[PDB]
């Protein structure tokens, strides 16, 4: 297979990966989902004019002076009295403004004159200021108007978006589906983690690592187990993956390519990338029954598997789930140590760290405390060149965020 | 421009 | 209640919040968990000397020359032959090195001499180089040694840590428990999201927002519903929370404090914070049956609830689940617009954005594309002072990461 | 020093 450049490989993954269809879900399951419909309000917020303050709903045209308090409007109740000249109604923040009143005067701008004998009721109050019409009242529809679009299709939902659906009472929404991702490992040397060692064998760690990475991003997964490195077993496992899942990931193992090509008639878009690590990374698509499955065969080395998973698989999954720009976030950071550059673009897991009052983070390449912490970035080193053969501590480089 | 290849230290 | 400074409030939450006890879990459930035990390897990795390359396992003392190939060692099998003078054994990467061989010569450093008539077997090969002892062999225990501590207590686990547990076959581990968090809303004006509006009422959004925020961080939650703003109903709901959960969060609503103090005998550590928004935030602890419950009563305003939840609740939860430094990550960013400073420290949701080849991100305070994206930071504005009454676009400020 | 109060623009 020819050596594909990193840029060609990445663009190829994004271009060939489909966007999944849509489904209707309950709002509370919306975390990380992308809306496939515009969402409109069916009510005004607030639906009644509401007091912004504790105080009194007044007729501004009465001006300052001594008023009879005819009642109280409290949150959650509809007032039934009309405020007439020389009257006011006590209000609390959020309470509906009664008919007849056109402003609110906050309590600090008043002095109580008389209180019921028992002391439970305010009877008369002096209004010390001249209210302007509308003052301290949130009018109907100030925050949201009926028929307004409050969230657009393409919005990637978090907690506040869920709370907005709640506010407008839209509890069922159309969203893109999440990809189901099947993971298998291939290699005759592999045992399950639960197993004791046997001669010549080691425990499979890549399956757990990859499954955990995908789960961390919120996508459902299928564990396809360890698969013998031979055509028959590979074909059976791939067939199961294709049946159960939208995406299949393998690591290890050239029978894989032979099965994909000759047995499955998949399109293998690249089988080698000019990158370090991850040279042997393979990406294929399969069009079957009107839909497109995507298949990644990652290298068996566990650092390579982790790295290629973050570079190629995660952005594909983000596209599949409807995210409009599925590219990862890249930030600037300072190198923590010198690095000789390789002819290939090189990627290294690191821990981004922000120091007191220093504007750029440091990228620590994986003392006491750093070993307590999971990698949250991928240092992206440029390929070797005439001028640049080495980079030094303190120099600013790109780091892909993969974890903060 | 976006690039998935690291850039030289500006 | 007296006005507590932000710093005193934050330190108080962290100091008074307990660390939860421990439980044993399966490794695959380890995402985001903190190990409560050191983890030791029970085997060497690799457990046998392994070839780093495709090539031939040789006796370095034979030097270069023409060799008989006596067999092949492949991954997953224990070789049963001993390599003698003038012999070599074909090896693939990861295969065990057979007795008698002390180095590996990669295939590119050889030329095949004879192949079986059928062409399926290599019979003789010319070794073109002088191997050094140990060359291209990963020795037993190179990566991990038996009895080595591979993860320390206090490690906050991600995908690679899970994969490390898999590698060493430690499938059950002691971890700190996650806090169970109960959320309720109080307010006579509130209806469930599922409800049509009635006069004077609005839909409760804070419960969904807060529950989604807590769930986003991985903690189990209990929905305690809308609670009438009166002592009897508040006491019943708080009692249910205390029974079912480690942490209780309310928003809205002064009956709450009265119930906490007089009915529950909770310790209310502060009831007002000098901050904007979030002035009325209340934090209390209750020691009952030998354990400590924590209670937050957040303001009813939905921006305030979100903001105080991120500032005070999330760091408490991170402490409860065993994270050794539970403080949030604060980074430097550039203001996107001018801001007049308030006498209180002020917190505003924003979207952090990194621009092409610009080292510091911009903090966009919540065009087409920004409305598609959830807030991922909290701008932390300094209190007003003699010299500083305003900050301008481009100026560098602190932003708490709450979402990237 | 850590602080949960924003600092002045250095």
Q: Which domains does chain A have, with CATH numbers?
A: 1-21+178-329 (3.40.980.10), 22-45+144-177 (3.90.105.10), 46-143 (2.170.190.11), 330-404 (2.40.340.10)
**Coil, strand or helix at C319:** helix
Distance (Å, whole) CA C27 – CA C56: 38
CB C188 within 8 A of CB A75: yes
Cβ–Cβ below 8 Å for B7 and C357 = yes
Nearest CA distance, A334 vs chain D (angstrom): 20
Residues of D in contact with A357 (CB under 8 A): 7, 10
Nearest CA distance, B1 vs chain A (angstrom): 12
Distance (Å, whole) CA A123 – CA A110: 13
Cβ–Cβ below 8 Å for C311 and D8 = no
**Distance (Å) of CA A132 to CA A104, A136, C169:** 9, 9, 74
Q: Which residues contact C170 (CB under 8 A, 6 or more apart)?
A: C27, C39, C40, C42
User: Position of tokens 């609390």?
Assistant: A92
Cβ–Cβ below 8 Å for B10 and C357 = yes
Of C381, C374, C278, C299, the residue nearest C338 (C-alpha): C381
Experimental method, per PDB record: X-ray
CB A349 within 8 A of CB A377: yes
CB C403 within 8 A of CB C377: yes
C-alpha torsion sign, points A152, A156, A159, A162: positive
What is the phi-psi region of residue C150: left when phi exceeds 0, alpha when psi lies from -120 to 50, beta otherwise?
A: alpha
Distance (Å, whole) CA A349 – CA C122: 40
User: Position of tokens 């403004």?
Assistant: A97
HSE at residue A340, side-chain half, CA atoms within 13 A, is 1
Of C79, C71, C127, C125, the residue nearest C104 (C-alpha): C127
Of C75, C117, C109, C67, the residue nearest C92 (C-alpha): C75
Cβ–Cβ below 8 Å for A207 and C166 = yes
Candidate from C74, C204, C354 with C-beta closest to A330: C354
CA of A358: which chain D residue's CA is closest?
D10
Of A45, A160, D7, A166, the residue nearest C307 (C-alpha): A160
Concatenated DSSP letters of C8-74 = HHHHHHHHHPPPP-EEEEEGGG-TT-BBSS-EE-SS-BSSS-EESSSEEEE-GGG-SEEEEEEEEE-
Q: Which residues contact C290 (CB under 8 A, 6 or more apart)?
A: none
CB C91 within 8 A of CB C81: no
Cβ–Cβ below 8 Å for C212 and A31 = yes
Distance (Å, whole) CA A97 – CA A51: 6
CB C221 within 8 A of CB C211: yes
Q: Backbone phi, then psi, for A207, in 5-degree steps?
A: -55, -50
Distance (Å, whole) CA A238 – CA C77: 25
Candidate from A327, A383, A396 with C-beta closest to B9: A396
Instruction: List subunits contacting chain A, requiring 3 or more Cβ pairs under 8 Å.
Output: B, C, D
State both tokens at A244. 């159960």
User: Position of tokens 């060497």?
Assistant: C44
C-alpha torsion sign, points C247, C253, C258, C259: negative
Q: Backbone phi, then psi, for A13, in 5-degree steps?
A: -55, -50
Nearest CA distance, C275 vs chain D (angstrom): 9
User: Position of tokens 């489909």?
Assistant: A18
Cβ neighbour number for residue C357 with a 10 Å cutoff:
11
| B1 in contact with A, Cβ within 8 Å | no
Distance (Å, whole) CA A206 – CA A200: 18
Q: Which residues contact A324 (CB under 8 A, 6 or more apart)?
A: A34, A154, A156, C372
Q: Backbone phi, then psi, for A152, in 5-degree steps?
A: -95, 150
Distance (Å, whole) CA A90 – CA A69: 7
CA of A348: which chain B residue's CA is closest?
B6
Q: Backbone phi, then psi, for A62, in 5-degree steps?
A: -75, -20
State both tokens at C300. 């009813």
Burial class from Cβ neighbours inside 10 Å (0-12, 13-18, 19+) for residue A118 reads exposed
- Name the helix (H) or strand (E) containing C157: none
Residues in chain B: 10
Residues in chain C: 404
Cβ–Cβ below 8 Å for B7 and C356 = no
Distance (Å, whole) CA A130 – CA A110: 11
CB C97 within 8 A of CB C58: no
Distance (Å, whole) CA A106 – CA A126: 12
CA of B2: which chain A residue's CA is closest?
A327
* D and B make contact (3+ CB pairs below 8 Å): no
E strands in A55-121: 55-58, 65-73, 87-91, 103-106, 110-115
Angle at C372 between CA C371 and CA C378, to 5 degrees: 65
Q: Which residues contact A216 (CB under 8 A, 6 or more apart)?
A: C31, C158, C159
Distance (Å, whole) CA A118 – CA C376: 52
Largest pairwise CA distance in chain B: 16
Angle at A138 between CA A56 and CA A112, to 5 degrees: 10
User: Position of tokens 């007439």?
Assistant: A84
Dihedral, A94, A98, A103, A105 alpha carbons, nearest 10 = -60
Distance (Å, whole) CA A322 – CA A315: 11
- Name the helix (H) or strand (E) containing C233: helix C231-244
Of C45, C117, C353, C22, the residue nearest A201 (C-alpha): C45
Q: Which residues contact C41 (CB under 8 A, 6 or more apart)?
A: C144, C145, C146, C147, C148, C150, C168
State both tokens at A216. 């961390």
CB C104 within 8 A of CB C137: yes
Find how far residue A203's CA is from the centre of its chain: 33
DSSP class of C325? S
Cβ–Cβ below 8 Å for D5 and C388 = no
CA of C38: which chain A residue's CA is closest?
A372
Resolution for the entry shown, Å = 2.0
Cβ–Cβ below 8 Å for C380 and D8 = no
CB A164 within 8 A of CB A7: no
- Name the helix (H) or strand (E) containing A393: none
| A80 in contact with C, Cβ within 8 Å | no
Cβ neighbour number for residue C138 with a 10 Å cutoff:
19
CA of C359: which chain B residue's CA is closest?
B10
Q: Backbone phi, then psi, for A10, in 5-degree steps?
A: -70, -45
What is the phi-psi region of residue A318: left when phi exceeds 0, alpha when psi lies from -120 to 50, beta otherwise?
A: alpha
Nearest CA distance, D8 vs chain A (angstrom): 10
Burial class from Cβ neighbours inside 10 Å (0-12, 13-18, 19+) for residue A129 reads middle
CB A27 within 8 A of CB C208: yes
Helices (H), A34-147: none
Cβ–Cβ below 8 Å for A160 and C211 = no
Distance (Å, whole) CA C198 – CA C205: 16
Residues of C with CB under 8 A from a CB of D: 6-7, 10, 311, 327, 345, 379-383, 385, 388, 391, 395-398
**Coil, strand or helix at C7:** helix
Residues in chain D: 10
**Coil, strand or helix at C123:** strand
Largest pairwise CA distance in chain A: 97
Cβ–Cβ below 8 Å for C372 and A154 = yes
State both tokens at A346. 């090189």
| C247 in contact with A, Cβ within 8 Å | no
Dihedral, A49, A54, A55, A57 alpha carbons, nearest 10 = 10
Candidate from D2, D5, D9 with C-beta closest to C396: D9
Facing residues of C39 across strands? Answer: C151
CB C56 within 8 A of CB C79: no
């Amino acid at each position: 297979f020819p050596l594909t450049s990193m840029d060609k490989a990445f663009i190829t993954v994004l271009e060939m990966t489909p966007v999944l269809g849509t489904e209707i879900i309950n709002y509370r399951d919306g975390m990380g989902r992308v809306l496939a419909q515009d969402v409109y309000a069916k009510d005004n917020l607030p639906p009644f004019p509401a007091s912004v303050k504790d105080g009194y709903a007044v007729r501004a045209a009465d001006g300052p002076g001594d008023r009879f308090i005819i009642g109280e409007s409290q949150a959650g109740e509809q007032p039934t009295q009309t405020v007439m000249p020389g009257q006011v109604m006590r209000v609390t923040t959020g309470a509906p403004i009664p008919c007849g009143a056109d402003a609110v005067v906050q309590v600090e701008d008043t002095e109580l004159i008389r209180e019921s004998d028992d002391g439970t009721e305010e009877l008369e109050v002096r209004i010390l200021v001249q209210a302007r019409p509308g003052q301290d009242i949130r009018p109907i529809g100030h925050d949201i108007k009926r028929g307004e679009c409050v969230l657009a299709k393409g919005t990637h939902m978090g907690p506040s978006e869920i709370g907005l659906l709640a506010t407008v009472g839209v509890t069922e929404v159309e969203v893109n589906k999440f990809p189901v991702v099947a993971v298998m490992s291939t290699g005759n040397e592999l045992l399950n983690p639960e197993d004791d060692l046997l001669p010549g064998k080691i425990r499979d760690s890549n399956r757990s690592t990859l499954l955990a990475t995908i789960q961390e991003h919120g996508y459902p997964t299928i564990n396809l187990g360890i698969v013998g490195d031979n055509p028959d077993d590979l074909l059976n496992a791939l067939n199961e993956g294709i049946s159960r899942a939208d995406v299949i990931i393998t690591s290890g193992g050239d029978y894989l390519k032979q099965v994909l090509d000759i047995d499955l008639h998949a399109q293998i878009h690249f089988g080698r990338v000019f990158m370090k690590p991850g040279l042997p990374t393979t990406f294929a698509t399969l069009d079957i029954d009107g839909v497109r499955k995507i298949i990644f065969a990652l290298p068996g080395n566990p650092v390579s598997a982790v790295v290629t998973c973050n570079l190629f698989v995660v952005p594909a999954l983000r596209k599949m789930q409807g995210i409009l720009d599925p590219r990862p976030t890249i930030i600037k950071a300072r190198l923590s140590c010198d690095v000789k550059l390789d002819p290939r673009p090189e990627y290294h897991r690191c821990i981004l760290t922000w120091h007191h009052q220093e504007p750029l983070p440091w990228a620590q390449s994986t003392s006491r405390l750093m070993s307590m912490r999971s990698a949250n970035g991928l240092l992206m080193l440029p390929p070797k060149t005439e001028q640049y053969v080495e980079l030094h501590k303190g120099e600013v480089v790109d780091v892909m965020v993969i974890g903060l | 421009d976006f690039s998935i290849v690291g850039s030289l230290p500006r």
